[PDB]
Amino acid sequence: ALDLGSAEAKAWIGVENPHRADVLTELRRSTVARVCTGRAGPRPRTQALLRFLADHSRSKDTVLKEVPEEWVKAQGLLEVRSEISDKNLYLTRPDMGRRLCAEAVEALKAQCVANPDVQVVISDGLSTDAITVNYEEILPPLMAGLKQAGLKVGTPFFVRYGRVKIEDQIGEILGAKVVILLVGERPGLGQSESLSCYAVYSPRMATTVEADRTCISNIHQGGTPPVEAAAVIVDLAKRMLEQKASGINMTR
Amino acid sequence: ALDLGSAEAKAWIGVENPHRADVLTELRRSTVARVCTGRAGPRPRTQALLRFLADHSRSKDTVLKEVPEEWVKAQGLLEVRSEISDKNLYLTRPDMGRRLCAEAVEALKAQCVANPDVQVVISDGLSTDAITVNYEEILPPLMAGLKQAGLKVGTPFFVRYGRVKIEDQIGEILGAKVVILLVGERPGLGQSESLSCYAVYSPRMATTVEADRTCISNIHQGGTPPVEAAAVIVDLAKRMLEQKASGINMTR
Amino acid sequence: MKLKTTLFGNVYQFKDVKEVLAKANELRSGDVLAGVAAASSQERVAAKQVLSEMTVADIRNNPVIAYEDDCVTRLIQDDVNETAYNQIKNWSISELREYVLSDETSVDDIAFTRKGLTSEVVAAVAKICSNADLIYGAKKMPVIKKANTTIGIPGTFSARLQPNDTRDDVQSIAAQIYEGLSFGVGDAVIGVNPVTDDVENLSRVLDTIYGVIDKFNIPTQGCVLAHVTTQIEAIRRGAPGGLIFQSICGSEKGLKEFGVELAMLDEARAVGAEFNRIAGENCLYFETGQGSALSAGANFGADQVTMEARNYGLARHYDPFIVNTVVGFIGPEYLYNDRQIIRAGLEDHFMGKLSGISMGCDCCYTNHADADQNLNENLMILLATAGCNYIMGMPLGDDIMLNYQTTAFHDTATVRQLLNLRPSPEFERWLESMGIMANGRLTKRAGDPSLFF
Amino acid sequence: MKLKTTLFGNVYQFKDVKEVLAKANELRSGDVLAGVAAASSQERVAAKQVLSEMTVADIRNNPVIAYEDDCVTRLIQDDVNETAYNQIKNWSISELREYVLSDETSVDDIAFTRKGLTSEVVAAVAKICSNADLIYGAKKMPVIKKANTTIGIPGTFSARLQPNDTRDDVQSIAAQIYEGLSFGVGDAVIGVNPVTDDVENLSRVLDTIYGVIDKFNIPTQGCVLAHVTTQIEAIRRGAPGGLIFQSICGSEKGLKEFGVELAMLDEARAVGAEFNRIAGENCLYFETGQGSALSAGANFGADQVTMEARNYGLARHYDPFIVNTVVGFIGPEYLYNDRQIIRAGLEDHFMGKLSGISMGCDCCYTNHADADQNLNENLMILLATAGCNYIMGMPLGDDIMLNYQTTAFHDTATVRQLLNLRPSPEFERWLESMGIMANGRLTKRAGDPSLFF
């Protein structure tokens, strides 16, 4: 008997007559990728196909699912929308996710601090798990590190249904010199808590291209740990204000 | 300078360097199958593909076309209904389309005649165009034919969203000795006006199989003409009542 | 056996083998309509794992309609080689999948092993196979039969000439025949569905087909696809017998719906041996398809994939020259879309080949289903790579009379020249002598029915 | 020219060539999102007919972004052989389609003819092709290039090894490489997408790839798929150069979004010539895909198929070793489901082969699109019959880091053994010497990375 979501199922070696079986364990240890599962002819083995299919059913569910509106409230965040109403419309209309709705603009002017040096924005994006799991490890050392021997920090807020070009509008309205977006990148098959940072110096909707952004991706416990990633993003924000550039316009 | 729906596009011969081009014309004339269009390598010629795709666009529209209910009123027909509400539900539930809804049973027991020798039912089924184009040519000489030199004729009515196994419930409710159903089959590519007749001697929902039915199919102007096909069905209904049998149970 | 498993901490319990067989299916429209489909993707995978852990003996000893109550079940059970079965009875379906797919398993290995299968076990293997599993699995299980042509040899690819007409008009039938032959279609059979089911119409349509066959000395066979009783009568009364056809279903109730008894098919074999113009030892032709048992009320709570496998166990008893599924012939109620019609096509062909029948496919759709001609061309090519024995051929694939779209004459010539496949060797030789084919390829003069005049 | 046809008695009027090109497309979610799609099937077919009546001149003289405004348009227009163009300029697109598909049109015929084409004309042919048209047409248009392997010879099939990791951990990269080679993947390239665009990190990844290459004397290429500027920097400072990669887009504004100037790609050619460990004359690697220009706001009212053709016209100028589209890499906003992803994959490959580049495909999908692994397996086999130059390989197709699903290592071995295709002849030689392959087939001891130890 086997749970396909178990650690034993993940550790399985399916190569049937190994050349060197002690090497096979060390190779399976080194990797999260589905190495060492063997074959039937040129086809996947049955257990490997079954665990693939199980992980896909679970990965499909991480797409649809949404953060509680009260989780954001109990985190002490402003919640604000894009132009998108719901999760079904989010997936088909990227253009609407790159724009704040009319009430979101007015809330940002009402309730957020004007002309910050560094603005931190959190969005669910395409993975709710990415921002739900990682938050308490990334965000408090991010807000401390920008303050502690640093400068004028913005008040952090949540955008529901955000895609990354929305941070150009956020930088324009708030007058922000640096805009940091932490956002859920699209879910992988066995893993859905991967976070990315997108950061841009002094953005403008008319002129800013994607290459002007710096990306820090794969933030999670299987990637770069969210604790030590916060120190990377603080260092990046410091450098961005120093040389007055982001992305491909940065040195070294 | 070509309409793809035109007679010229229908008659087009596309064979490049023909052995005998006068034979090709007669072969094209002999059939409404899409012969003699030639090839490019092993693939269809462009115009033959275009005329295919044009006809398919027209064909898809015919499947979800419906009668006006006021057309059904103007034919002098009772409209009665299956369990299905919409055309989208008809296409996905066969099982609801072969038994009547709860107000349809009470309509048939109040308004239609009891224990006929012959009982004629019309349904749109899968093609509305099949019973709209053909009706004036089918129904008058059929309903005259069963009375004029015959015996006891039933009162004809319309079933919306009907599939052919609904005529077993119609035969049990009305006590009918022969139950004829004229119904739209699947629309083809080039043509959507093909009518079928399905007919049982003395049907019963528990007992009767599909082989107990006689089928006569492809009733339109390009098959068997609806006037002379009406003479075929009356002769078939006479032969049903004589030997007390239909379908595979019939002689010769 | 286990009828339960744990997936992601959740216990998934199933009532019987029949429910496990049903719910392990890839999603299709007819399984939902039968009320037998999985409720979620997780339960589908759980059903797949329970099925894979179930043994060959588990599924053999639980057929979906009982032995006492069903002549098709009896026929399938009684045809089992018990020595082949006893070798494999304690294999899991997982192990049987991996056995079929293995490059160390030869055609002769499967030749004996498949004799210990029943149809339900054949279905169970297909349910835990991916699309590429179904294609590669079928490809390494060739089935070869012989009428006046040999079909199913690896490296070959055949086609039914289907010259149907609204009136059974013999000029329109002949026109479509001359067209098909000019593309190299007709090595499987020249096969007409008639509009009228009577002897003198059957004989006249058979005279038209064999008029062309005899004039040009074509190595092939003719068929008129009426009810088997009418064919037998026509051939007895002296019409040319080629192949003898019957549509079949995977239960006794389904056969009774079709108006067929098993003794009719026994009579068909005996009438073939007395009368028919066939050089080889195979002369029967069956058509099948997912949904037919469901339509008849004759699936008995089983899914349409298991029911369709039982068609192949039935067909195998009679050792036919050809069988094809008719994959999207009925409509969207049973298979809704491109991906459902592809998946069913690959399932049906794999299951046929595993049952040891000469399996082809009518790659087709209807106009009230969510599909187009690009689907037909997708599916025909995938199935050709799986070593599908034959497809249909009609002028651009438009059936003017059965009101659906199948594959073009063009499409067989396309597949052959794309994949370097040949016709039936007897028929290829005829095509080369007519100047229609050289080295597997259509000549300049090909594609032109005027060549015969 | 005519912007106008009558279909079933109704006039269908279009504004410009751009609108005709857009609406002639098969339905996809990207064209609807762009606002450029046909309103119905009737208007789609009307757009197809209007397009097919237009000449090569009509569409060449109307590029979707103007000559003076766009450096990619200038590159495409200035690369035209005008003598080849003047031969074919008065051909209709109908006639050009039938010319491509013709068995009397040889590889040498298309070799001159394609030099008279622009990308918009290449797109125009693809729009009036069926799925089987796209597959057959692409197959009779082989494109052969050479690095340390030769790719694109008919009868062969190559694969990129894609050994990606969340941390660029050199043991996890190596483990995936040893897995991939044991299935015979990597004759196209061993190509890592890195987490950090960084010279120290790039060199360490490249040292790991070429550690395995130099140890076992493998005839293949290494690549690290960072931005082209950081690749060039790392190779200049003395990291092993194999293939040099850039993602490209079909407009100047699209290139600006990616941070790419044309002179970077010139520099990549010159750096490759000075530094790279490549025996043959091709050393560049591009990736493309439908939706990218639309995402960048850089499609300028044009559909994503026409934009993707312009990628290939850009790519052709630099005569790269390999190009692949990344067909379902982005998600459902541009291509929603199985049917759309298949159609786009067949379109992109046909257009690449027609433009005369070494065209492969990442047969792939995302977890927020309506798609599964059976689609990857459907598409990889269809494209392999089309003579697709290469696909990707990952362990069961699971990217742990780019968060999508491509084809397995299994899948390349399946395709090869299904269709009797070989690797690159140099890489096949190496596989045979390693005991991994005999006669095209994986040996018993293949599929096992412990063989290398």
Ligand code: B12
């Ligand atoms: C999907 C994807 C793309 C898509 C873009 C998606 C779209 N247009 O809708 C395409 C195929 C276009 C693409 C292209 C490139 N990408 Co990319 N991409 C990804 C991927 C897999 C998903 C990112 C995601 O989920 N975003 C979250 C969603 C919610 O945001 P979104 O608004 O819907 O999408 C935006 C961003 O994804 C952004 N984006 C995508 N890639 C990149 C790369 C950089 C450097 C930047 C600044 C932005 C950016 O473009 C979209 C704007 O509409 C990640 C890998 C990962 N695990 O995250 C890599 C990844 C972010 N990309 C990468 C790279 C290098 C590239 C290229 C520069 C490749 C090259 N060498 O030329 C190009 C150019 C990007 C550009 N300047 O526009 C690297 C970034 C490395 C880094 N630390 O800076 C990553 C991390 C993958 C890797 N190789 O490690 N990519």
Ligand code: B12
């Ligand atoms: C789809 C179809 C089937 C499907 C039925 C499933 C279904 N849901 O319809 C399948 C694949 C099972 C099938 C099988 C056969 N069919 Co059929 N079928 C068709 C088709 C293409 C559609 C008819 C239609 O659209 N009906 C209208 C819709 C609205 O009704 P429905 O409730 O959805 O469908 C019912 C009827 O179609 C009925 N039915 C289907 N076929 C037949 C055949 C006969 C003789 C009878 C009495 C009833 C019948 O079964 C369904 C009840 O659930 C027609 C071709 C045409 N020209 O129309 C042939 C057609 C009706 N069938 C034909 C034949 C001969 C057969 C077979 C007997 C083949 C054989 N020779 O063994 C078998 C057995 C059928 C049986 N006796 O039960 C002939 C009938 C000839 C005649 N006048 O007697 C036709 C006309 C085609 C032809 N060859 O010319 N078929």
